[PDB]
Design a protein around this ligand. Structure first.
Ligand SMILES: CC(C)NC(=O)[C@H]1CCC[C@H]1Nc1nc(Nc2ccc(C(=O)N(C)C3CCN(C)CC3)cc2)ncc1C(F)(F)F
Lengths: 36, 268
């Protein structure tokens, strides 16, 4: 399967998750139970 | 982020306060786990501040043996947690399948656990609930601490909350004393024993007898255990918290050095 290969590829070729996801703005913890 | 930014592959199971799904983030084709929590359900159960603390702790930890929380987002009805996908799943299922782990597997998990807990402790984070059920396994079977339900950032490092799981409770919690980060050293010892034996060391027919065995440190080693594994467990399972073997000591223990096959995952 293409998924099993992609999972193996992710282990050997890790991405910069800190830049790709961490840098993107997040909702305030106090806002999580409020309006979107 | 929105749920439309992800392609849901399949469900992975039911978590404590929500279902988990295997998903792929569309922009980067990156495979991750998505934990879906319902805002109304969490508010009704009154676990809002509990979830906030768990997210606050986990989202700021970056270690190969701690499950990563990449980010989080919310919509009208749901809160979504973007989490690292652990391909080999639940550690407790593997332990139940094999009955007990061999020395190589147990020592590897002990080195990974001690390294992850050391990283927590150097940030004044106490886990307080180390047990097989709170651990996942990576692509190469690497241990991943994946629940922070009882965790606390303790700057004064002196707490009173009785927490965790019956078989893993340290004597100081049972006796109603104050506790510190050394509770994690005790739990690491119980975990090592459970990995090698398949049962926790103070297993009893009643909660009162389990409490009694714990506070007396009524440790009875099965004869199949090696001298090295018994030495490490005995050094962790000390009645007095200051006498417990430090996490650096676990990583340096000769039984860990001789049997661990720890592999650090590739990094960016
Ligand atoms: C609190 C504690 C840590 N547990 C949890 O959070 C639970 C809650 C539900 C699932 C899990 N959470 C996660 N699970 C994974 N991976 C995983 C899980 C299950 C399997 C699997 O189905 N099998 C191996 C097999 C497949 C074949 N069948 C037949 C048996 C099981 C394979 C991979 N990655 C990340 C997470 C996370 F945490 F990010 F949400």
């Amino acid at each position: 399967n293409l998924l099993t290969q992609a999972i193996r590829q992710q282990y050997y070729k890790p991405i910069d998750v800190d830049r790709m996801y961490g840098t993107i703005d997040s909702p305030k913890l106090e806002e999580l139970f409020n309006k979107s | 982020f929105t749920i439309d930014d992800f392609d849901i592959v399949r469900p992975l199971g039911k978590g404590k306060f929500g279902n988990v799904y295997l998903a792929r983030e569309k922009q980067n084709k990156f495979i991750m786990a998505l934990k879906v929590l319902f805002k109304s359900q969490l508010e009704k159960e009154g676990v809002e501040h509990q979830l906030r603390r768990e997210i606050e702790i986990q989202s700021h930890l970056r270690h190969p043996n701690i499950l990563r929380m990449y980010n989080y987002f919310h919509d009208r009805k749901r809160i979504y947690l973007m989490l690292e996908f652990a391909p080999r799943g639940e550690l407790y299922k593997e332990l139940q399948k094999h009955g007990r782990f061999d020395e190589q597997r147990s020592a590897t998990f002990m080195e990974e656990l001690a390294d992850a807990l050391h990283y927590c402790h150097e940030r004044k984070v106490i886990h307080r609930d180390i047990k097989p059920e709170n651990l996942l396994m990576g692509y190469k079977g690497e241990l991943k601490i994946a629940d922070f339900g009882w965790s606390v950032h303790a700057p004064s490092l002196r707490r009173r909350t009785m927490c965790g799981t019956l078989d893993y409770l340290p004597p100081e919690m049972i006796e109603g004393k104050t506790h510190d980060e050394k509770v994690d050293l005790w739990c690491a010892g119980v975990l090592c024993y459970e990995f090698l034996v398949g049962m926790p060391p103070f297993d009893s027919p009643s909660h009162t007898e389990t409490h009694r065995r714990i506070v007396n440190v009524d440790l009875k080693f099965p004869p199949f255990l090696s001298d090295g594994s018994k030495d490490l467990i005995s050094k962790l399972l000390r009645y007095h918290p200051p006498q417990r073997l430090p996490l650096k000591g676990v990583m340096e223990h000769p039984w860990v050095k001789a049997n661990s096959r720890r592999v650090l995952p590739p990094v960016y």
